[PDB]
């Protein structure tokens, strides 16, 4: 590998843009770099930001798990759009409708758990009644003191 096949600075003159497009093995009409706001991209192409799962899975790929050919310019976040990771494939339900349905369902369920905590169910019974001063010594109460008498009656 040599220097003028490595990525360089941001192309401004159209012959420099065409030389960059020849370097990354793509058409000048399809070569778009990241916009020069000074984030450190240079002449690197802004590939369209799609995942690798979206590719044709029956195509004879050079790298089958990557779904990526030889010499094809890799995406800047190619390690992010591997099929082990972020997939941007289209979904049957819309993204915003999915977010609204999930948010509304979770918020409604948490609301109704708070409602049921405010208004709990119970049984029509008295409290459970325990002997020996509501079990004073069994709950670790000290014997050198003396509690109040808890008295239960028959009914």
């Amino acid at each position: 590998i040599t220097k003028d096949m490595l990525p360089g600075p941001y192309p401004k003159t159209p012959e420099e843009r065409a030389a960059a497009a020849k370097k990354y093995n793509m058409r000048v009409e399809d070569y778009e770099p990241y916009p020069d706001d000074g984030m450190g991209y240079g002449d690197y192409p802004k590939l369209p930001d799609r995942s690798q799962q979206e590719r044709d899975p029956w195509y004879d790929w050079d790298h089958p798990d990557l779904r990526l050919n030889w010499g094809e310019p890799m995406h800047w976040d190619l390690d992010m759009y591997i099929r082990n990771r972020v997939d941007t494939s289209p979904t049957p339900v819309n993204w915003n409708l999915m977010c609204k349905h999930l948010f509304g369902f979770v918020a409604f369920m948490l609301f109704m758990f708070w409602v049921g905590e405010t208004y709990p169910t119970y049984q029509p019974v008295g409290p459970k009644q325990y002997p020996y001063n509501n079990l004073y010594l069994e709950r670790g109460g000290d014997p050198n003191k003396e509690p109040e008498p808890v008295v239960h009656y028959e009914i």
Partner: protein, 177 residues
């Protein structure tokens, strides 16, 4: 879209691919076989109703709203064959697809366990390394200037010669090693 030899998709190819995808997603919707068979004939009638449309702009528009019809009426979990991509057995055996060149890395005491196999392998290796320069000079005398337009490879235009770039298609591993 993205094809190895074709540069695009014709209207006929788009219609056939939409027809197959509509039948597959319909079979996902219509689980039972008689019921799918009934609705598959109804969908075939819907595809046959606009088959004789010589106006290409009208036909492309009908294809477009039929794709909208499909994207509305698709199953959220369509049926996928197990070894098909997205299937439950897809690329399962790729960890068992050891490439053939690793057989060159074996110790001789484990190459001598299969003497007929490696004696039969060395003539494949010899055949490939004599075929290589003939198929290179076949490729450079048939490829146009500017490089190859398509990814289509030629066959062997003589007798005795092997097709160019044949080794990794022939010596690919089995699907069930």
């Amino acid at each position: 879209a993205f094809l190895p030899s074709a540069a695009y998709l014709t209207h006929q190819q788009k219609v056939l691919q939409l027809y197959k995808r509509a039948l597959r997603h319909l079979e996902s919707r219509c689980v039972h076989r008689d019921k799918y068979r009934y609705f598959a004939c109804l969908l075939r009638a819907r595809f046959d109703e606009h088959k004789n449309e010589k106006d290409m702009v009208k036909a492309t528009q009908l294809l477009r709203e039929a794709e909208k019809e499909f994207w509305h009426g698709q199953h959220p979990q369509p049926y996928i064959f197990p070894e098909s991509p997205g299937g439950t057995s897809y690329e399962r055996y790729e960890c068992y697809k050891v490439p053939e060149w690793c057989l060159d890395d074996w110790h001789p005491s484990e190459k001598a366990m299969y003497p007929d196999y490696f004696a039969k392998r060395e003539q494949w290796k010899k055949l490939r390394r004599e075929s290589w320069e003939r198929e290179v000079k076949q490729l450079q005398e048939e490829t146009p200037v500017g490089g190859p337009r398509t990814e289509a490879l030629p066959p062997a235009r003589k007798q005795g010669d092997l097709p160019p770039l044949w080794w990794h298609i022939v010596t690919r591993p089995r699907e069930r090693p």
